[PDB]
Design a protein around this ligand. Sequence first.
Ligand SMILES: [Mg+2]
Ligand SMILES: [Mg+2]
Ligand SMILES: [Mg+2]
Ligand SMILES: [Mg+2]
Ligand SMILES: [Mg+2]
Ligand SMILES: [Mg+2]
Ligand SMILES: [Mg+2]
Ligand SMILES: [Mg+2]
Ligand SMILES: [Mg+2]
Ligand SMILES: [Mg+2]
Ligand SMILES: [Mg+2]
Ligand SMILES: [Mg+2]
Ligand SMILES: [Mg+2]
Ligand SMILES: [Mg+2]
Ligand SMILES: [Mg+2]
Ligand SMILES: [Mg+2]
Ligand SMILES: [Mg+2]
Ligand SMILES: [Zn+2]
Ligand SMILES: [Zn+2]
Lengths: 98, 150, 140, 80
Amino acid sequence: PVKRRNAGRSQKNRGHTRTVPCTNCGRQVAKDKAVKRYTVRDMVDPSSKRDIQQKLAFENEKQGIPKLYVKLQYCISCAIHSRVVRVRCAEDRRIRRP
Amino acid sequence: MQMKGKGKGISGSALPFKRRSPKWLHMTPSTVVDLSVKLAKKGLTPSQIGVILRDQHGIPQVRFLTGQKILRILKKNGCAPQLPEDLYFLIKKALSIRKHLEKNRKDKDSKYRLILVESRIHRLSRYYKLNQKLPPKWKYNAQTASALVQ
Amino acid sequence: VIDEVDGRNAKTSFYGLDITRDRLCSMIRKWQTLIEARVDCKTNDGYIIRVFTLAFTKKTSAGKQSSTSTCYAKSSQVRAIRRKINTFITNEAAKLGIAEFSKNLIGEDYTKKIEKETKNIFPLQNITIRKVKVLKRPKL
Amino acid sequence: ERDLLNPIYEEEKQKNKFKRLIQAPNSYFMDVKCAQCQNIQMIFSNAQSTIICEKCSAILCKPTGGKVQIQAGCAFKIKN
RNA sequence: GAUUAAUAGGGACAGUUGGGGGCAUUAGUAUUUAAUAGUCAGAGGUGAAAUUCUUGGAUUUAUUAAGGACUAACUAAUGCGAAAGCAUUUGCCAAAGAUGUUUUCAUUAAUCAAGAACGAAAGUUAGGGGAUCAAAGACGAUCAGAUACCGUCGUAGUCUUAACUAUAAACUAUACCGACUCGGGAUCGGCUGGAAUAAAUGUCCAGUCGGCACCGUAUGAGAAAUCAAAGUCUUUGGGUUCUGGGGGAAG
Ligand SMILES: [Mg+2]
Ligand SMILES: [Mg+2]
Ligand SMILES: [Mg+2]
Ligand SMILES: [Mg+2]
Ligand SMILES: [Mg+2]
Ligand SMILES: [Mg+2]
Ligand SMILES: [Mg+2]
Ligand SMILES: [Mg+2]
Ligand SMILES: [Mg+2]
Ligand SMILES: [Mg+2]
Ligand SMILES: [Mg+2]
Ligand SMILES: [Mg+2]
Ligand SMILES: [Mg+2]
Ligand SMILES: [Mg+2]
Ligand SMILES: [Mg+2]
Ligand SMILES: [Mg+2]
Ligand SMILES: [Mg+2]
Ligand SMILES: [Zn+2]
Ligand SMILES: [Zn+2]
């Protein structure tokens, strides 16, 4: 029978959508389908920043360390296994942004 | 909505109720008939003439005022546009396509589009011929089109 | 670029202008539009440039850009700005010295000017001159 | 509950041109008085072209989808 | 002496919209590879390592160049295209929807055997091109076995011109045209009123045509999953095309 309405993807008008490589397996996945979560990563762990702030050098505009920018793109296959998105129950499958 | 299993809507135009001519305007049928044929002589489409009489000289619907449809007025006054707008134009673009296709002998979307447009023209011929409104030996192939080009 | 050396000293002329990841990735939200204008300027100095511009559409309704807020700008309006931006800069260069141009490019002078011509087409935000490359610099 | 034969004026004023019962257009006609010659010319609410004043040769209206913007300060009565 | 003018259909026209298409042009990093310099013993790759590469200098850092492909981030249940499919700039070439119409034409139309136009990949013929990845192949490793899932390389292809091939879970697995019937906001394109600023190819409020899509719900449908249509079919009949008739052998 049928499991989803969007079958995991958002292709709603067009017949074909660009394919993209998986951040983790390298596998090819259609853009719309594949998981995404472009995150604002930080250069150093918590208590570890303070250590670099005191031994820091250049001016101090209070702008600290540049934060890392990671544009994340997972294919289902590994996205799951990678703790990202856990198999959700029946009616919770339609919930968006919990 | 013609050759379209998927696209379809409603452009506009709904003749107002009151079948008489607007109040404000005064013009014996004849007055208009002059403008109409004069304008026509200059080389105009009954399609375009009517547009003027509405935009320019406040005559909403020549038919309502004369009791005559433009093309008829024109035909009675010798000023009849040989080949109907209908066919004429279709064939025009039908042709324009061919010219563009030449220098772009690879443009496939256009090959297709022309196929549709040429298809229509065969539909008008079938029609206009059956209403003895166009000689039976009429035939649009490439020579019928270039024939009008001269 | 080290252009000349005066014993123990390195003298340098203009070669390139740019930005960084902090800023670039910085102004990049997913509910606005992104515009870019490439330009080949002519300076009276006998210098050829390429200047990249970075434009972003600005909201105007208090609604913090959400999935519900759309700050897109009809592609026709986009190029409308390119056409305007580039055209402004090719004239700006034809009337300046590399010393003046570089000075101006780094300054919020052009951010304001572009902002002026643009609010006419569609109010922008974070305007930048992403990058500048010295294409061909005569050494008269 | 609503009567379909004696429908409110507002309701029908909102509906789409072709949805109203008797079904009539929105377009109208207007006498425009040039900003100079003064000549009063009739122009259609949905002119599909630029219009000149047959007296001098001034510009009266610019064409658009539906509306016709009137050039500068010209006069306009809505004949009806 | 010639019915209206079909919330039927064809044309004219008007601003506008689109990653629709064809020629041009034009970038941008990156991957390779090369020059110019710079050091120094390891690089690379895996769970571990191993073939691999390297002081006739690797990996590495800066500049630059050649080259072939590719268009990131913005790019989303958003857009266009008959479908396949389509995202750097700019300029041409013919085309398209929708909206707007007190413009013409007035059945011109719906669908369709024949009969044609298209139709990613892969594949084929004859030339180009050859950067990356890579069927076959050559190798390492893993295994009781591995010509397999990892790793090192590599030919065809992948790119292109001109021919040919027509299939695909070519999928919404839901034929097209038409009329109806629940609620609701949010969208994309056009239009019409209005308000604030301001006088903006902007913003908002309110309409409304047309286009993806969603939310809620049905004393309507179903075998159910579920369906706003998969509804208005035992209260069994708007028009038309194609298809099936237990399974396997079998497309
Ligand atoms: Mg497909
Ligand atoms: Mg209809
Ligand atoms: Mg909006
Ligand atoms: Mg184009
Ligand atoms: Mg490698
Ligand atoms: Mg290069
Ligand atoms: Mg879009
Ligand atoms: Mg881009
Ligand atoms: Mg063929
Ligand atoms: Mg070959
Ligand atoms: Mg063993
Ligand atoms: Mg390899
Ligand atoms: Mg308005
Ligand atoms: Mg609205
Ligand atoms: Mg059934
Ligand atoms: Mg529902
Ligand atoms: Mg039945
Ligand atoms: Zn993966
Ligand atoms: Zn005047």
